[PDB]
Design a protein around this ligand. Structure first.
Ligand SMILES: CCCCCCCCOCCOCCOCCOCCO
Ligand SMILES: CCCCCCCCOCCOCCOCCOCCO
Ligand SMILES: CCCCCCCCOCCOCCOCCOCCO
Ligand SMILES: [Cl-]
Ligand SMILES: [Cl-]
Ligand SMILES: [Cl-]
Ligand SMILES: [Cl-]
Ligand SMILES: [Cl-]
Ligand SMILES: [Cl-]
Ligand SMILES: [Cl-]
Ligand SMILES: [Cl-]
Ligand SMILES: [Cl-]
Ligand SMILES: [Cl-]
Lengths: 231, 234
């Protein structure tokens, strides 16, 4: 009688200006607070690599006024080229949502990455901000986003302000979003894009995302399917 | 040739106004970033209902360097309770980020956040955090002002503890002296206060002693404790 969530799904993504094809298969299960995610991803020209990924999530607390949980995960980048060099990534993320006002909400995730051999390299990636909620269907989100590599050798900073406007009307999800990359070591850059999604009400859903980015034109386009069965 | 830190130590603590005796044994080892801590603690009424804490703890220090440093602890503790009017147990899982960040040559923004989840008998999420600023005068002297919060979450329920804490760590020769005060702001809004002195000594051979005296009030409270720690490396 014990309630499980079994999701399985896959995504195809391509980024062009030729390009990168990105097959993605994933599935995950959930019991009460606990959740487990396995995923396999691969990157190649249509030199390549693949991502085995395991992830666990414990949701400590979920209630209106405050909610938070913690993700761990392991990923492996097998690189194959034109010899098999591998790189591992350990990820610990706190993720939270906090109630300020009926509209206002302070939430976000913080991610602590540690990279294994071949290729120290600590990394912090964070997206945290405010969600204003207009009504059931519409909400605005402005986040601060930062990725930092730490400490020849070394790494640098990425800073962006992101804005999404999630729109849920009937079976459709529409989420326009922009990323304004701030200086972040240098000059301005920009991503804009639309995230469409659809739900057939039966556990099947589709995800279509288009994005343009520039500094240097960039075209991202991707699709996905997900099936949700419970128990 | 591989560098380990083996520490072992114990502490005796008593809190009175009768009172609570608190035997504590602990030891831990460290390799590069990684560290492991085991500890056993016990709480009971002396003479001139109790419980005991088995505790395991792991710490990964991701980054240590002047300008920025951080790491993450996890740990498991078990409170065996034994009583008078049957052995009921309670488990506690702890995930703490801990950080230190460089603002200025003097100023430093650091602290730890702790996420507790409690197991059966007796949900109960808990957040405990101490975060603040460290001003550094010189090698020997530094001031620390932190914000401290403990929160239990969501008959049934829990409440808030809020405090501002101040320590003045003083390292002169072999001696550590750390006066500290805790001004408890909130519970339901009554005021309360702890004051205390933390003495410590190092014999330079790996042995060290820790003597701490504290008074607290709202309701007088007397805490006194001692400890020894031995550090051998490799
Ligand atoms: C990874 C492939 C996922 C595709 C799921 C197919 C299930 C669609 O039918 C569900 C019932 O309607
Ligand atoms: C887990 C037990 C921790 C130790 C218990 C403390 C109570 C009495 O122990 C006193 C230990 O004193 C001996 C210190 O070690 C010898 C000194 O080492 C210096 C030689 O280089
Ligand atoms: C609470 C447990 C904390 C520590 C207990 C585990 C002790 C294991 O330590 C073993 C130390 O190192 C193992 C072998 O040492 C390296 C030998 O080879 C190096 C020379 O090439
Ligand atoms: Cl987000
Ligand atoms: Cl509406
Ligand atoms: Cl937008
Ligand atoms: Cl998106
Ligand atoms: Cl202790
Ligand atoms: Cl404790
Ligand atoms: Cl602290
Ligand atoms: Cl003081
Ligand atoms: Cl002490
Ligand atoms: Cl104490």
């Amino acid at each position: 009688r014990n309630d499980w969530h079994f999701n399985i799904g896959a995504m195809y993504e391509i980024e062009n200006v030729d390009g990168l094809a990105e097959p993605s298969v994933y599935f995950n299960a959930a019991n009460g607070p606990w959740r487990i995610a396995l995923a396999y991803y691969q990157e190649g020209p249509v030199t390549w690599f693949d991502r085995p990924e395991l992830e666990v999530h414990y949701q400590f607390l979920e209630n209106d006024d405050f909610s938070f949980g913690l993700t761990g995960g392991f990923r492996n980048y097998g690189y194959h080229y034109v010899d098999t060099a591998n790189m591992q990534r350990w990820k610990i993320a706190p993720d939270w949502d906090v109630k300020l006002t009926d509209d206002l909400r302070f939430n976000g995730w913080l991610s602590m990455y540690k990279f294994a051999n071949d290729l120290a390299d600590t990394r912090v990636e964070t997206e945290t901000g405010l969600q204003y909620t207009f009504n059931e269907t519409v909400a605005l989100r402005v986040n601060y986003y930062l990725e930092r590599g730490f400490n020849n050798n070394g790494e640098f900073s990425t800073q962006e302000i992101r804005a999404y406007l999630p729109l849920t009307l009937g079976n459709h999800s529409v989420t326009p979003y922009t990323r304004i990359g701030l200086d972040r070591a240098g000059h301005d850059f920009n991503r804009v894009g639309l995230f469409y999604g659809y739900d057939f009400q039966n556990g099947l859903s589709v995800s279509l995302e288009y994005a343009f980015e520039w500094q240097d034109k960039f075209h991202y386009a991707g699709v996905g399917v997900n099936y949700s069965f419970h128990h």
